[PDB]
Design an enzyme around this catalytic site. Structure first.
Site, short mmCIF file in Angstrom:
data_model
loop_
_atom_site.label_atom_id
_atom_site.label_comp_id
_atom_site.label_asym_id
_atom_site.label_seq_id
_atom_site.Cartn_x
_atom_site.Cartn_y
_atom_site.Cartn_z
N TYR A 6 0.82 -1.23 0.00
CA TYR A 6 0.00 0.00 0.00
C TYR A 6 0.85 1.27 0.00
O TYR A 6 2.02 1.28 0.32
CB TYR A 6 -0.97 0.01 1.19
CG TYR A 6 -0.25 0.19 2.53
CD1 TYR A 6 0.26 -0.93 3.27
CD2 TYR A 6 -0.04 1.49 3.06
CE1 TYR A 6 0.94 -0.73 4.48
CE2 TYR A 6 0.62 1.68 4.27
CZ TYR A 6 1.11 0.57 4.98
OH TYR A 6 1.76 0.71 6.20
N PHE B 42 1.97 9.69 3.51
CA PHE B 42 2.45 9.46 4.87
C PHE B 42 3.06 8.10 5.07
O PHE B 42 3.78 7.93 6.06
CB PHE B 42 1.35 9.71 5.93
CG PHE B 42 0.07 8.99 5.73
CD1 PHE B 42 -0.05 7.65 6.06
CD2 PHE B 42 -1.04 9.61 5.18
CE1 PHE B 42 -1.24 6.97 5.86
CE2 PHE B 42 -2.21 8.94 5.00
CZ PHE B 42 -2.30 7.61 5.32
N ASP B 43 2.83 7.10 4.20
CA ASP B 43 3.43 5.78 4.43
C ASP B 43 3.34 4.97 3.17
O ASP B 43 2.42 5.14 2.35
CB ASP B 43 2.73 5.06 5.58
CG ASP B 43 3.47 3.88 6.16
OD1 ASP B 43 4.70 3.74 5.90
OD2 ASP B 43 2.80 3.07 6.87
N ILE C 283 -8.38 0.29 10.20
CA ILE C 283 -9.47 1.24 9.98
C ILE C 283 -10.57 0.62 9.13
O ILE C 283 -10.33 -0.24 8.27
CB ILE C 283 -8.94 2.56 9.37
CG1 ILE C 283 -8.21 2.34 8.04
CG2 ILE C 283 -8.06 3.28 10.41
CD1 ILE C 283 -7.80 3.63 7.37
N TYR D 11 -9.43 7.49 11.02
CA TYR D 11 -9.04 7.74 12.42
C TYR D 11 -9.93 8.77 13.11
O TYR D 11 -9.71 9.07 14.26
CB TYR D 11 -7.57 8.12 12.51
CG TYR D 11 -6.68 7.03 12.01
CD1 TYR D 11 -6.38 5.95 12.83
CD2 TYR D 11 -6.14 7.03 10.74
CE1 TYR D 11 -5.58 4.91 12.36
CE2 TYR D 11 -5.36 6.01 10.27
CZ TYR D 11 -5.04 4.95 11.08
OH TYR D 11 -4.26 3.91 10.67
N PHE E 55 -5.85 5.49 -0.07
CA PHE E 55 -4.83 4.44 -0.14
C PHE E 55 -4.88 3.79 -1.50
O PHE E 55 -5.96 3.46 -2.00
CB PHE E 55 -4.99 3.33 0.90
CG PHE E 55 -4.69 3.72 2.31
CD1 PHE E 55 -5.62 4.42 3.09
CD2 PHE E 55 -3.50 3.36 2.90
CE1 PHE E 55 -5.36 4.72 4.41
CE2 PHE E 55 -3.24 3.65 4.22
CZ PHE E 55 -4.17 4.32 4.99
C1 LIG Z 1 -2.05 -2.51 18.99
C2 LIG Z 1 -1.01 -2.79 18.38
C3 LIG Z 1 -0.05 -1.71 17.79
C4 LIG Z 1 0.04 -1.78 16.26
C5 LIG Z 1 1.10 -0.88 15.74
C6 LIG Z 1 2.04 -1.14 14.85
C7 LIG Z 1 2.26 -2.47 14.21
C8 LIG Z 1 2.97 -0.03 14.41
C9 LIG Z 1 2.86 0.36 12.93
C10 LIG Z 1 3.78 1.55 12.69
C11 LIG Z 1 1.39 0.63 12.61
C12 LIG Z 1 1.04 1.13 11.20
O1 LIG Z 1 1.87 0.52 10.18
C13 LIG Z 1 1.49 -0.83 9.86
C14 LIG Z 1 1.10 2.63 10.93
O2 LIG Z 1 0.32 2.72 9.71
C15 LIG Z 1 0.15 4.01 9.13
O3 LIG Z 1 1.38 4.51 8.66
C16 LIG Z 1 -0.76 3.67 7.94
O4 LIG Z 1 -0.37 3.76 6.79
C17 LIG Z 1 -2.16 3.25 8.22
O5 LIG Z 1 -2.97 4.17 8.34
N1 LIG Z 1 -2.49 1.94 8.27
C18 LIG Z 1 -1.52 0.85 8.09
C19 LIG Z 1 -1.96 -0.08 6.96
C20 LIG Z 1 -3.37 -0.56 7.19
C21 LIG Z 1 -4.30 0.62 7.27
C22 LIG Z 1 -3.90 1.56 8.41
C23 LIG Z 1 -4.30 0.94 9.75
O6 LIG Z 1 -5.43 0.61 9.96
O7 LIG Z 1 -3.31 0.77 10.63
C24 LIG Z 1 -3.69 0.13 11.90
C25 LIG Z 1 -4.12 1.15 12.91
C26 LIG Z 1 -3.10 2.18 13.30
C27 LIG Z 1 -5.33 1.02 13.44
C28 LIG Z 1 -5.93 1.77 14.61
C29 LIG Z 1 -5.84 0.92 15.87
C30 LIG Z 1 -6.54 1.61 17.05
C31 LIG Z 1 -7.98 1.94 16.73
O8 LIG Z 1 -8.62 2.60 17.82
C32 LIG Z 1 -8.06 2.79 15.49
O9 LIG Z 1 -9.47 3.02 15.25
C33 LIG Z 1 -9.78 4.00 14.30
C34 LIG Z 1 -7.40 2.11 14.32
C35 LIG Z 1 -2.49 -0.72 12.38
C36 LIG Z 1 -2.03 -1.69 11.30
C37 LIG Z 1 -2.87 -1.46 13.66
O10 LIG Z 1 -3.77 -2.54 13.37
C38 LIG Z 1 -1.67 -2.05 14.39
C39 LIG Z 1 -1.24 -1.36 15.60
O11 LIG Z 1 -1.85 -0.41 15.99
C40 LIG Z 1 -0.46 4.97 10.13
C41 LIG Z 1 -0.58 6.39 9.60
C42 LIG Z 1 0.35 4.93 11.40
C43 LIG Z 1 0.51 3.54 11.96
O12 LIG Z 1 1.36 3.55 13.10
C44 LIG Z 1 0.63 3.89 14.31
CL LIG Z 2 -3.31 4.48 16.37
#
Ligand SMILES: C=CC[C@@H]1/C=C(\C)C[C@H](C)C[C@H](OC)[C@H]2O[C@@](O)(C(=O)C(=O)N3CCCC[C@H]3C(=O)O[C@H](/C(C)=C/[C@@H]3CC[C@@H](O)[C@H](OC)C3)[C@H](C)[C@@H](O)CC1=O)[C@H](C)C[C@@H]2OC
Ligand SMILES: [Cl-]
Ligand SMILES: [Cl-]
Ligand SMILES: [Cl-]
Ligand SMILES: [Cl-]
Ligand SMILES: [Cl-]
Ligand SMILES: [Cl-]
Ligand SMILES: [Cl-]
Ligand SMILES: [Cl-]
Ligand SMILES: [Cl-]
Ligand SMILES: [Cl-]
Ligand SMILES: [Cl-]
Ligand SMILES: [Cl-]
Ligand SMILES: [Cl-]
Ligand SMILES: [Cl-]
Length: 111
Positions: free
Chosen positions: A30, A41-42, A60, A86, A103
Site C-alpha cells: 500500500y 504518509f506511508d 481502519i 481515524y 490508499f
Molecule cells: C495494537 C497494536 C499496535 C500496532 C502498531 C504497529 C504495528 C505499528 C505500525 C507503525 C502501525 C502502522 O503501520 C502498519 C502505521 O500505519 C500508518 O502509517 C498507515 O499507513 C495506516 O494508516 N495503516 C496501516 C496499513 C493498514 C491501514 C492503516 C491501519 O489501519 O493501521 C492500523 C491502525 C493504526 C489502526 C488503529 C488501531 C486503534 C484503533 O482505535 C483505530 O481506530 C480507528 C485504528 C495498524 C495496522 C494497527 O492494526 C496495528 C497497531 O496499531 C499509520 C498512519 C500509522 C501507523 O502507526 C501507528
Molecule cells: Cl493508532
C-alpha cells in the site's frame, strides 16, 4: 464528497487469484495519503508485506470494507471518510484529526 467509502478498481490481477474474505489473513502492499493535499504518509513498497486479519476491526474500517473481495494481484484505490479512518484522533503524528484518506492497495496473498 461521498456519503461513504469509494473503492475503485485500478487494475485486475489473477481472475482465479485467491480472494480476500473475512477471517483470512491477507497481505497487502500500500501507499497512504492525505486526500486533502495528496501528501504521502506511508508505504510498505520495498519493505515487509503488511498482513492483517480481514474483518476483525484491527485496521481502519475503510480497509476492512475496501480490501474485502480483492483477488491476488488486484489493485484498488480507497477514498476513506474520517469516520472510516481515524476520526477526530488522527494517527502516527502523521494524519491530522478529521482526515479524509486515500490508499492505493495491492493484494499480495491470502492465508
Ligand atoms: C495494537 C497494536 C499496535 C500496532 C502498531 C504497529 C504495528 C505499528 C505500525 C507503525 C502501525 C502502522 O503501520 C502498519 C502505521 O500505519 C500508518 O502509517 C498507515 O499507513 C495506516 O494508516 N495503516 C496501516 C496499513 C493498514 C491501514 C492503516 C491501519 O489501519 O493501521 C492500523 C491502525 C493504526 C489502526 C488503529 C488501531 C486503534 C484503533 O482505535 C483505530 O481506530 C480507528 C485504528 C495498524 C495496522 C494497527 O492494526 C496495528 C497497531 O496499531 C499509520 C498512519 C500509522 C501507523 O502507526 C501507528
Ligand atoms: Cl493508532
Ligand atoms: Cl472502479
Ligand atoms: Cl485490469
Ligand atoms: Cl496479477
Ligand atoms: Cl493466488
Ligand atoms: Cl515491493
Ligand atoms: Cl472477520
Ligand atoms: Cl471480530
Ligand atoms: Cl467471486
Ligand atoms: Cl466521515
Ligand atoms: Cl469521525
Ligand atoms: Cl497536512
Ligand atoms: Cl480532509
Ligand atoms: Cl501512487
Amino acid at each position: 464528497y461521498p456519503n461513504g467509502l469509494i473503492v475503485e478498481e485500478l487494475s485486475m490481477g489473477k481472475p482465479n487469484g485467491k480472494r480476500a474474505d473475512p477471517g483470512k489473513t491477507v497481505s497487502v502492499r500500500y501507499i497512504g495519503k492525505l486526500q486533502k493535499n495528496g501528501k504521502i504518509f506511508d508505504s510498505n513498497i520495498g519493505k515487509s508485506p503488511f498482513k492483517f486479519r480481514l474483518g476483525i476491526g484491527s485496521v481502519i474500517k475503510g480497509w476492512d470494507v475496501g480490501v474485502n473481495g480483492m483477488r491476488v494481484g488486484d489493485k484498488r484505490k480507497l477514498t476513506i471518510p474520517p469516520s472510516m479512518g481515524y476520526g477526530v484522533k488522527g494517527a502516527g503524528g502523521q494524519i491530522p484529526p478529521n482526515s479524509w484518506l486515500t490508499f492505493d492497495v495491492e493484494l499480495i496473498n491470502v492465508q
